[PDB]
Amino acid sequence: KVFGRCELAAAMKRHGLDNYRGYSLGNWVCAAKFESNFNTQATNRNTDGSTDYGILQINSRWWCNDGRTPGSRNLCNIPCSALLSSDITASVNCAKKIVSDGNGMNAWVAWRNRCKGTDVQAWIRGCRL
């Protein structure tokens, strides 16, 4: 599923992402725009053999199990394909764990380089939230 901008924002707000760990909803929508272009089915292989899955591009080295990243952890206790569903519940719950890890939203490279320090509020402007 390829979410709309205000469609996603409403979904993440309902799943408890507005101001989760102090990151306003605009940070999450901006991060999803640039990590996956709002596409739940996005995947990307990295040089280290790991793969990023889903609308927030969660990595297989420590967070989900895809059965092909040797020596990896599964801290969100889910198969990576569960991160690919049109229901973002799995992606949101796992991201809550990632954003609490200590480095915050800097664990997403696209957020750090394309959303951090910007007017992220423009990403929810005009949305009926």
Selected from 1.10.530.10, 3.20.20.150, 1.20.120.720, 3.40.50.740, the CATH number assigned to the domain covering 5-123 reads 1.10.530.10
Q: Which residues are annotated as a binding site for substrate?
A: 101
For the chain, report the end-to-end CA distance as a whole number of angstroms. 20
Note whether 60 and 66 are within 8 A (CB).
yes
Domain boundaries, the chain: 5-123
3-class secondary structure, 23 = strand
Strand order in the sheet with 43-45: 43-45, 51-53, 58-59
Say what the resolution is, in angstroms. Answer: 1.8
Catalytic residues: 35, 52
40: closest CA among 10, 2, 92, 4? 2
Experimentally, the structure was elucidated by X-ray
Query: What is the identity of the amino acid at 103?
Result: N
Rounded alpha-carbon distances, angstroms, from residue 80 to 18, 73, 75, 88: 24, 12, 11, 12
C-beta atoms surrounding 75 within 10 Å: 15
